[PDB]
Design a protein around this ligand. Sequence first.
Ligand code: NZD
Length: 284
Amino acid sequence: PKSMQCKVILLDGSEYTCDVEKRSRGQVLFDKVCEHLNLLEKDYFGLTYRDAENQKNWLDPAKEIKKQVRSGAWHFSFNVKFYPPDPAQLSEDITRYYLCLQLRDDIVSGRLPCSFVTLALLGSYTVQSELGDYDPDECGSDYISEFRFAPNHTKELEDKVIELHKSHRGMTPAEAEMHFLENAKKLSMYGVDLHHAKDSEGVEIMLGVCASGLLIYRDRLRINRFAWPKVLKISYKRNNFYIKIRPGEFEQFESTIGFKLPNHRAAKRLWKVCVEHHTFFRLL
Ligand SMILES: CN1CCN(C(=O)Nc2ccccc2)CC1
């Protein structure tokens, strides 16, 4: 029985290596990574791989790994797939911990924009969780944390983390992680998967996929929002993505909104993430 070596980047930046039978479905590898991580609330998470175009794709747990990675390396990342709107409702602290790790990477990477003060506040909870109570012995007037808090670090930001860290004395890791999530969950781009697209007129937009629905970022004035219940049908064809917007009260007909994606693979990827978000966040 021939086995393929899999390498998984974990959310703490370390690497997990295992083997699976070469005809394995994604679920087999995902089950091994989750066991390694001691993670039971697995439904929020998944594995990503880079396709031949270097795009991030979700590994489909129901399909053979080899039919997804195709000609590429069996190299994956462990990621949050479905960002819970209310992390306080997750049953385990360790779930909230991985969610924190993911969001810290979302912030550092610039995928999750954040004000100065929220960067410092989120940083201060991470430091409280990881080092415990503020200690002046470690931090002089010139202190710079090993911790990555933001796309761009300034001394002002490091100083503000320390000032907020002072206020969290006696806070337990689970308690600091819950506070981290209470603040992070409110950010306008929390759990928004962004896709480059063009509207029916060829104007460049972004499409956001999240728990609530589909967001159209047309310009800074007017953001269109389609709550999942208002969406009956999601389709793709060639380079196009279509949504069928439920008829309003006393309207005779469904309406159709069409978007152009860079290529057919980009259209299919957006279609699958929408269908997956719609199925997941319906059961709420
Ligand atoms: C101030 N808002 C609060 C709600 N939330 C959304 O945008 N939700 C949404 C609603 C309908 C369709 C798509 C998304 C985050 C920021």
